[PDB]
């Protein structure tokens, strides 16, 4: 529902934090209008409603086909601020080179995501090995009995790639939906049979 985000940065940054001190060193001792720009935009929002030509769409598809190398949420909003920047700097008509600053801001938008919710790298491995730890003991045990003291002492220490209790409780609610197991308190369970 939002189009592009940004994060502000921070570090020690000794050449810049010293420079930021120089700003606050000043502004204590001793055209940038207050109304002229305000009437400049409030005229310029509803009077001229600008156009769109082929000169933008040819470069526009040239951006996304390399971008595919979201789907269309990013595509709908990417023209709107491209339109408004053409509406701002040239209060007449469309621009063809207004899109390099469109791709300037959104390329900085995707810089914030280099590094579960929109990601599946942990989710291509967590559903696999948890589909393995059922089939082994269910081929050892003639019953479907699996108590709580066994599962803490089986799957917390086979591998150290999974968290202890933050995701093992939600690991079983999907198996509650996928015709495997049932819940009977913080103890005994009941598993799948053939």
């Amino acid at each position: 529902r939002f189009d592009l985000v940004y994060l502000v940065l921070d570090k020690v940054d000794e050449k810049n934090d010293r420079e930021l001190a120089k700003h606050l060193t000043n502004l204590y001792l001793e055209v940038l209008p207050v109304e002229f720009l305000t009437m400049y935009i409030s005229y310029a929002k509803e009077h001229i409603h600008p156009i769109i030509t082929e000169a933008a769409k040819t470069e526009l598809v040239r951006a996304y086909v390399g971008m595919r190398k979201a789907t269309t949420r990013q595509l709908e909003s990417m023209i709107r601020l491209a339109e408004a920047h053409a509406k701002m700097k040239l209060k007449n008509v469309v621009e063809l080179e207004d899109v390099q600053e469109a791709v300037r801001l959104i390329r900085s938008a995707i810089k914030d995501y280099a590094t579960q919710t929109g990601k599946s790298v942990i989710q291509r491995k967590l559903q696999e090995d948890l589909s393995r730890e059922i089939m082994n003991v269910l081929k050892d045990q003639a019953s479907d009995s699996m108590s709580f003291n066994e599962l803490i002492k089986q799957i917390n220490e086979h591998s150290q790639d999974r968290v202890e209790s933050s995701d093992i409780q939600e690991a079983l609610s999907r198996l509650q939906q996928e015709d495997k197991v049932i819940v009977l308190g913080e103890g005994v369970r009941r598993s799948v049979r053939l």
């Binding site: 020690v12 934090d17 010293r18 001190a21 204590y28 001792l29």
Partner: protein, 84 residues
């Protein structure tokens, strides 16, 4: 959004507390609490001193802002050492 903090933690310490014991027991046999060679001051006097001090508002020089930019750098570096 604040600037400074304090604390009122209690550590066991023998010499202070017996002095603190005489501190609280002295107020019962008599009724007066003053001591320790301090002449007590009327609150109107400092109130006039505050109100006179509130009518000055001095303006800083340049060497002070030169001394705080080096202060903030030395404030920046050690705070960026712990990270704990």
């Amino acid at each position: 959004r604040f600037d400074i903090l304090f604390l009122m933690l209690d550590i066991p310490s023998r010499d202070d507390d017996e002095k603190l014991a005489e501190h609280v027991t002295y107020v019962h046999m008599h009724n007066k609490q003053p001591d320790l060679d301090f002449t007590p001051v009327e609150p109107s006097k400092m109130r006039e001193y505050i109100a006179y001090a509130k009518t000055k508002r001095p303006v800083m020089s340049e060497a002070v802002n030169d001394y705080v930019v080096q202060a903030y750098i030395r404030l920046r570096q050690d705070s960026k050492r712990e990270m704990d």
